[PDB]
Coordinates of C-alpha atoms in Angstrom, one line a residue:
Chain A
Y1 CA -8.4 130.0 11.3
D2 CA -11.0 127.7 12.7
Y3 CA -10.4 124.1 14.0
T4 CA -12.4 121.1 15.2
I5 CA -10.7 118.6 17.5
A6 CA -11.5 114.9 17.0
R7 CA -10.5 111.8 19.0
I8 CA -10.4 108.1 18.5
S9 CA -8.7 105.6 20.8
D10 CA -8.0 103.4 17.8
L11 CA -4.5 102.0 17.7
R12 CA -2.9 102.8 14.4
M13 CA -3.4 106.5 15.2
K14 CA -1.1 106.0 18.3
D15 CA 0.7 109.4 18.6
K16 CA -0.4 110.2 15.0
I17 CA -1.8 113.5 13.8
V18 CA -3.5 114.0 10.5
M19 CA -4.8 117.3 9.2
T20 CA -6.6 118.6 6.2
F21 CA -9.2 121.1 4.9
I22 CA -13.0 120.4 5.3
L23 CA -16.1 122.5 4.9
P24 CA -18.7 122.5 7.7
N25 CA -21.5 124.2 5.7
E26 CA -22.3 121.7 3.0
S27 CA -23.9 118.3 3.4
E28 CA -24.1 117.6 -0.3
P29 CA -21.3 116.2 -2.6
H30 CA -18.8 118.8 -3.9
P31 CA -15.2 118.9 -5.2
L32 CA -14.2 120.7 -2.0
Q33 CA -14.7 118.3 0.9
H34 CA -12.0 115.7 1.8
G35 CA -14.4 112.8 1.5
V36 CA -18.1 111.9 1.2
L37 CA -19.6 108.8 2.8
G38 CA -22.3 107.6 0.4
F39 CA -24.7 105.8 2.8
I40 CA -27.7 103.6 1.9
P41 CA -29.9 102.9 4.9
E42 CA -29.9 99.2 5.7
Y43 CA -32.4 96.7 7.0
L44 CA -32.1 93.2 8.3
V45 CA -34.0 90.0 7.6
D46 CA -34.9 87.1 9.9
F47 CA -35.9 83.7 8.7
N48 CA -35.5 80.0 9.3
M49 CA -32.8 78.1 7.3
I50 CA -31.7 74.5 6.7
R51 CA -28.0 73.9 5.9
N52 CA -26.4 70.5 5.6
Chain B
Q1 CA -29.7 75.0 0.1
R2 CA -31.2 78.3 -1.3
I3 CA -34.5 79.8 -0.2
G4 CA -36.9 81.7 -2.5
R5 CA -40.6 82.4 -2.4
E6 CA -42.5 80.4 -5.0
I7 CA -46.0 80.1 -6.4
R8 CA -47.1 76.6 -7.1
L9 CA -50.0 75.7 -9.4
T10 CA -50.9 72.1 -9.9
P11 CA -54.0 71.7 -12.1
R12 CA -56.1 68.6 -12.1
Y13 CA -58.7 68.4 -14.9
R14 CA -59.7 66.1 -17.8
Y15 CA -62.2 66.4 -20.7
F16 CA -65.0 63.8 -20.7
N17 CA -67.0 63.0 -23.8
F18 CA -70.4 61.5 -24.0
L19 CA -72.2 61.8 -27.4
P20 CA -71.1 59.3 -30.0
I21 CA -72.0 61.6 -32.8
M22 CA -69.5 63.9 -34.7
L23 CA -69.5 65.5 -38.1
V24 CA -66.4 66.7 -39.9
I25 CA -65.8 68.5 -43.2
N26 CA -62.4 69.0 -44.9
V27 CA -61.9 71.7 -47.6
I28 CA -58.8 71.8 -49.8
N29 CA -57.5 74.1 -52.6
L30 CA -59.6 77.0 -51.4
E31 CA -56.6 79.2 -52.4
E32 CA -56.5 78.0 -56.0
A33 CA -60.2 78.3 -56.9
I34 CA -60.3 81.9 -55.9
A35 CA -56.9 82.4 -57.5
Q36 CA -57.8 80.5 -60.7
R37 CA -60.5 81.0 -63.4
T38 CA -62.7 78.3 -61.9
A39 CA -65.7 78.2 -64.1
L40 CA -68.8 76.1 -64.7
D41 CA -68.0 72.4 -64.5
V42 CA -70.6 72.0 -67.2
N43 CA -71.9 68.5 -67.8
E44 CA -72.0 68.1 -71.6
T45 CA -74.4 65.2 -71.8
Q46 CA -73.8 62.5 -74.4
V47 CA -76.0 63.4 -77.3
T48 CA -73.8 62.4 -80.3
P49 CA -73.1 58.8 -81.4
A50 CA -71.3 57.5 -78.3
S51 CA -74.3 55.9 -76.7

């Protein structure tokens, strides 16, 4: 069995362990990965505005 | 309080007229004459006792 260790200092995981099955060979959506993060690249806009 | 790019077009023109001469013709019942048996409006000319 093969494992990958992850860490976050975030608080709600204080002494909390979660574990599940993931696949490290596919980058594409498939019914066999725990979750997929659909990401749209994002850009900013800068302009001058009047408000009240 | 919302911003959006706009294209403004404000024309300024006026039609000036000089010549005080104009000729107009009005035609009516163009439909009917083609549609109807419009024939010679012959002028029977008053040769019998009426004159």
